[PDB]
Design a protein around this ligand. Structure first.
Ligand code: MET
Ligand code: MET
Ligand SMILES: [Cl-]
Ligand SMILES: [Cl-]
Ligand SMILES: [Cl-]
Ligand SMILES: [Cl-]
Ligand SMILES: [Cl-]
Ligand SMILES: [Cl-]
Ligand SMILES: [Cl-]
Lengths: 243, 243
């Protein structure tokens, strides 16, 4: 059957990723803001659930978040979470909240023209940094290395940026939204190269055969139709600090 | 509960729309080809269902196709079918098979800059053609006419083209993929104008709470990941016959 989320408490898993989910230390506690938190508020206001927002532990991967939900740790998870076939085997996803694709990230001045350089072996595989438990890893294993885990593994975006800046790796992969955001606002010495790749979608993770699937989907689609999702994207992503 | 589609017969509703579902008569019998027919065969090969493909009667609308499925006339429906909030109330949708948006269609030479001209009343409402029972109608009512069905109603794409060419209407709306195909291959004197609008997705229509939801979704996502959906889009949409 189906039912409405009105009155229900949802444990909502979120994962740090600026400007989707921004974690600020304050004194001492944490305050969450961002596209995701604003989305939650639009859904809460319309649907009437009580939002119990739970930030995933540091270094949790995207796959880890999904598995945690599947094991009953959260009721739903909201973020820049790519819909993939392996994930869909164990959880369901809402209608898409955003289109997505990936970009190559590198230091400015690095002699890389695009994905051909990665696939032709111009870069040593152990100098391609890949965050384990991400769709980027899925792409890498499918399209670059033929199943071999021969990349430089990364535990977080922060390790990615630090390793690029330190010259420990030469490239990595990011989703296009955050890729643009961080290269235009935080790391002025990092840049994007090549064509975008792996066109995909982000969706809200839910349990398989969830009682509340229809309620959530109708509401997401209504936010899409009425321009709210576009408004939130502009609010959080249309900024550029770097000169 | 859940089940696999192997060995199961699916009645698959399709709807004429070149080059998604292309309908020919031959000598008397009907032949179907296109992106949709190829997609069905990719899914059949991997999932092992028995395909019973059924073409919707002439002048069936997109809303009509969805309602026919909800009434039990089909098991699934595959085509250039937009996922909307109103439809999700009565049916479910698979994982997206394609991103989508709409374009303004017009005769070459018509002095329309973009959607603002329609919203400002540059065009008399009876010269804006809208196919009833489509997402274009939904958009018109929400964003242009404040709920007033004051447009020139159309029963099919053919009536849309004929009406534009005869000078009975000045503009209509199409999905981007087919809009490009038709103006680049069939009607060389029609053209597209303005920014894209109503970003959306296409999905396979299924019953709500369907037993086979996961099997279908995992397989669509696998076709995405392995590049088959990209290959199919290239095969059917890359052509440009017009000079
Ligand atoms: C470029 S990989 C970034 C994370 C990705 N959106 C995921 O869900 O795995
Ligand atoms: C521009 S409306 C074209 C039909 C649309 N894809 C629908 O499902 O209603
Ligand atoms: Cl969707
Ligand atoms: Cl990323
Ligand atoms: Cl499911
Ligand atoms: Cl999707
Ligand atoms: Cl416009
Ligand atoms: Cl169309
Ligand atoms: Cl449902």
């Amino acid at each position: 059957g189906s039912a409405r989320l009105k009155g229900i408490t949802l444990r909502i898993g979120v994962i740090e990723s600026v400007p989707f989910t921004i974690v600020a230390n304050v004194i001492n506690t944490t305050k969450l803001t961002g596209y995701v938190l604003d989305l939650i508020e639009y859904l809460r206001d319309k649907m009437g659930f009580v939002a119990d927002v739970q930030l995933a532990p540091p270094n949790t991967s995207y796959t880890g978040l999904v598995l945690a939900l599947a094991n009953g740790d959260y009721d739903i998870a909201i973020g820049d979470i790519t819909v993939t076939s392996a994930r869909r085997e164990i959880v369901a996803f809402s209608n898409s909240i955003s289109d997505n694709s990936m970009r190559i990230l590198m230091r400015k001045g690095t002699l890389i023209d695009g994905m051909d350089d990665l696939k032709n072996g111009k870069i040593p595989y152990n100098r391609i940094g890949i965050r384990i438990g991400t769709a980027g890893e899925d792409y890498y294993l499918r399209e670059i290395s033929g199943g071999s885990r021969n990349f430089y593994p990364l535990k977080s975006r922060q390790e990615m940026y630090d390793s690029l800046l330190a010259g420990i790796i030469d490239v990595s992969f990011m989703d296009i939204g955050t890729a643009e955001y961080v290269t235009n606002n935080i790391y002025c010495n990092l840049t994007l190269v090549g064509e975008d790749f792996d066109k995909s979608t982000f969706g809200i993770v839910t349990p398989k055969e969830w009682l509340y699937a229809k309620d959530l989907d109708v509401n997401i689609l209504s936010l899409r139709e009425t321009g709210i999702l576009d408004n939130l994207k502009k609010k959080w992503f249309q900024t550029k600090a770097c000169p």
